[PDB]
């Protein structure tokens, strides 16, 4: 599975007369755990952002003046939110405590909004000393009329 | 029974209900390994933070000691006290770091830079110099310290 | 070795009357291992970029017309690729699978390219969901005219 | 002590009290068997969901790579990055499934169809083909893939 | 490490023709614990005051009419509070119960505000019988329009 | 790995109707050990030259009049030495004692200096009878105004 891509890249190098290199990495018992922790935290942040995108679009559709697809049959309205973060302004609140792990969630939540059609100019980040101050900063962030969803990352347990 | 995680959740839920805006609340969950990694990281950060804080205090003490200013008293007992204010406003700093073990010395440097900035230190006044190893530090530190527009020099080695 | 530097810095601080400080970061057995892993990945990406730089320079010299060097004063011509990456356009393809470790190779290659005189404007990065679609994105990018070398980074094994 | 089931109940009770409307709140209760059944079902659903998501990303990467558009940068460092947006708007898809083990492959197909639709994929652009077994897949997949109005083909076998 | 300073002080005494003395203290097994408890309580009070200074400056900047430094790249606003307690009025509430230990926190919290640029004339201290009366006194203290932050020290657990 | 090269070259030779020959060489343990020793010596010389190149560029940019190359995003300025030996003049000091070993390091540094863009006219080599004359010879080489770095290799230990 890994040798075939190298063979193809070698053949492409011979065909195109260009230097094409290919490289892999061998992992011991510990780097696997490190990478798994990083991937898990990134996935947590990704899901946290996705759950807010869906709720924002659900709010957009629920108050709208047009109904959409019914149930598996008909005569039963269904309301749901699309995973399209286009034109939505977000606000992220993170805690400086354990920043070496909170920043992983922050980075894994920004790129989801970017890849779902959102531009970085509509993202506002706020950092607070600890988890205790999260609600009172999220309150002031929500006070802004140019905010559609709030994502908050703490560090406990 | 935590007195913290319960109250933050109650406050966030009531805020979301009162303002009709989604507030996703997520925390971390570590078990005996990520806790150790995080503790090592924050220990390195605190090491660099106090490394910069001591230099700030010493610079302010030097400025106040040889300056002409009537200082305050302990409590009003006329015994004047000379001490260094933790206000790095107007001070210029120079940091020397060795790229050997950069994955940790960079955490030290970052934990010192923000310590300087948050205390009022302007970003224009911090100068960073990198050297291949600790054995190169003395000459570069001498060159930085000879400058008149430098109030403190902080350096980081390797282990 | 670590003591002479600190003593010199203390003497300099005493001479110039300014807070010159020196601090050394300790390391336990776990953080030593994580630092070792990071350094290993960085060096892997560094050499991966260096080889491509040399090959691109050699190919440019072969296609060009310059009798730059000779061997020990003899009339024979020896063709060699310099390690100056100025004026070369690169293309990096990386698998997002195990991105925590792949990004180290990516940043090491970028650091080597920029340190060898290259520019960040001439680097093009492509991310693919896995290693099985590396060939198609690789050849699609490599068939572009403004690309001098292609470096591919797969996912971890074992 | 759950931080979730308590807060949802408190919020629903306060909502019912404040709005004078009955809000029946019921949850599930499983013991070591329904949990396993649900986990198997959601695992199959996630398998089909990621199966469709990878195809969406690859189609968008193909469109962007050979297209004439100045792409954004990593952080502002002029290194342009080519990546596939997860917006299946305007893309047309074809799914091939084998009715062998339909009670699971239909869950896969359903977990892919909603994944396409929620990302902006219109329902008019999804074409589904069923075959008696996996051995019939290659020819039908060839017939679907030869079509010009098809941007991706997803297929499901049996085990 | 301890003899070099004494040698330097002796040389300075000989140079300047002035009486310069130097003295250290040897600690047994118990005075170390006493000093560590005192230092720990002082540090707790110091951190308690610092976390309120940062929040006060965060409130000052968050409602202001000027944005500041972005993220590691750009296009993402970041809001944070400086550790400059200049011009800020504080209010401390302490409990008389276990005063022999609460006063340590009070003293370790006053000097932090003093050393961060705050003058003692902007500090107001209130003592209450027990921890139960802390919120209702902090309410009246916050009712004052010349208060920017409240720090409260109880004694339980 | 080794034979695919031969198959490809045979195919190319048949395509072009032109003699292309490929062959390999078999080695025993003694030759393997001596060649790995030689390669180790070459690598040592290579690293020794690379460090000097970086330090010379660092000093030149540190005392250069222009100020640029700020950190990404922030306004702080980072001083670092590029690995480009163009325009730099070097000086090498070697001892005739164990020349069979010293010359390998000398060549392993000269080739690095040349391959990093450095012209051969800027390299100056000085040989001394032993390592005990290195200090004064290096002093005399350093006193020159057209020398940017000095690298000195001693005897075996």
UniProtKB/Swiss-Prot annotation, chain C:
Which pathway is this protein assigned to?
Cofactor biosynthesis; riboflavin biosynthesis; riboflavin from 2-hydroxy-3-oxobutyl phosphate and 5-amino-6-(D-ribitylamino)uracil: step 1/2
Q: How does activity depend on temperature?
A: Extremely thermostable. Has a melting temperature of 119.9 degrees Celsius.
Its Enzyme Commission number? 2.5.1.78
- Superkingdom in the source lineage: Bacteria
The record lists the catalysed reaction(s) as: (2S)-2-hydroxy-3-oxobutyl phosphate + 5-amino-6-(D-ribitylamino)uracil = 6,7-dimethyl-8-(1-D-ribityl)lumazine + phosphate + 2 H2O + H(+)
Which Pfam families does the record associate with it? Answer: DMRL_synthase (PF00885)
Cross-referenced InterPro entries, in alphabetical order? LS, LS/RS, LS/RS_sf
Q: Which GO terms describe its biological process?
A: riboflavin biosynthetic process
Q: Which residues bind 5-amino-6-(D-ribitylamino)uracil?
A: 22, 44, 97-98, 131-133, 155-157
Q: Which GO terms describe its cellular component?
A: cytoplasm; cytosol; riboflavin synthase complex
NCBIfam families in the record, alphabetically?
A: lumazine-synth, PRK00061.1-4
Q: PANTHER family given for it?
A: 6,7-DIMETHYL-8-RIBITYLLUMAZINE SYNTHASE, 6,7-DIMETHYL-8-RIBITYLLUMAZINE SYNTHASE DMRL SYNTHASE LUMAZINE SYNTHASE
Per the entry, what this protein does is: Catalyzes the formation of 6,7-dimethyl-8-ribityllumazine by condensation of 5-amino-6-(D-ribitylamino)uracil with 3,4-dihydroxy-2-butanone 4-phosphate. This is the penultimate step in the biosynthesis of riboflavin.
Record's protein name = 6,7-dimethyl-8-ribityllumazine synthase
Source organism phylogeny = Bacteria, Pseudomonadati, Aquificota, Aquificia, Aquificales
